[PDB]
Amino acid sequence: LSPEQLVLTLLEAEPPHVLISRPSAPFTEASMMMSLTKLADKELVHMISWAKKIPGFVELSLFDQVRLLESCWMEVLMMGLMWRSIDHPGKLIFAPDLVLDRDEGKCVEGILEIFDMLLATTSRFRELKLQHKEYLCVKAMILLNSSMDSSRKLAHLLNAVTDALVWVIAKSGISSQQQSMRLANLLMLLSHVRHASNKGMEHLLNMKCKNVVPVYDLLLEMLNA
């Protein structure tokens, strides 16, 4: 499989956007958490299908597959959220009709801070003018690198996606030095996505314990890991 075929494969593997409507009345702490948990639950199902289309993923042991997904799902969700919000400064596009303003994060104790880092990282990506093909590679890298001889195959799979990312960046036509520089700048942002990802999961566990919103089935299993 060439780097291009891998990118074309991930491009087709992109999950379709989940449709969820914004509550009629202005958000309350509960209606918002309900909107988010419901969206995540639906996206999680699509995320599983997306993963099985990443070349070689299904060839790993069921246990690696599960460990990989439990370990990064929220970071994958937010990477997708940031890409969707790339062209909407100050705005977070959780879904087509679920556009949250940075302000609305006020009705949910301790979520605003997370909305801020999400919007900040999104701006860093806008600033770097992240490209669709780069985005697809990075998101898949998030999944394959959350390792938090099937182990030997995981590495090979990760290098293949990295190889594709390098290929895409080369297609931009910038100097070899700048290709290296852009590669570094893109990956250094995974730390920030991850941060907002950890703040998001810890914040979700907290709302579940506070019984602010019900969390069960798929969503709960992923939350506990």
Binding site: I48, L62, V66, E221
Partner: peptide
């Protein structure tokens, strides 16, 4: 197990 189901039964 839902996660396992989606990964193998779907």
């Amino acid at each position: 197990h839902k996660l396992v189901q989606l990964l193998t039964t779907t």
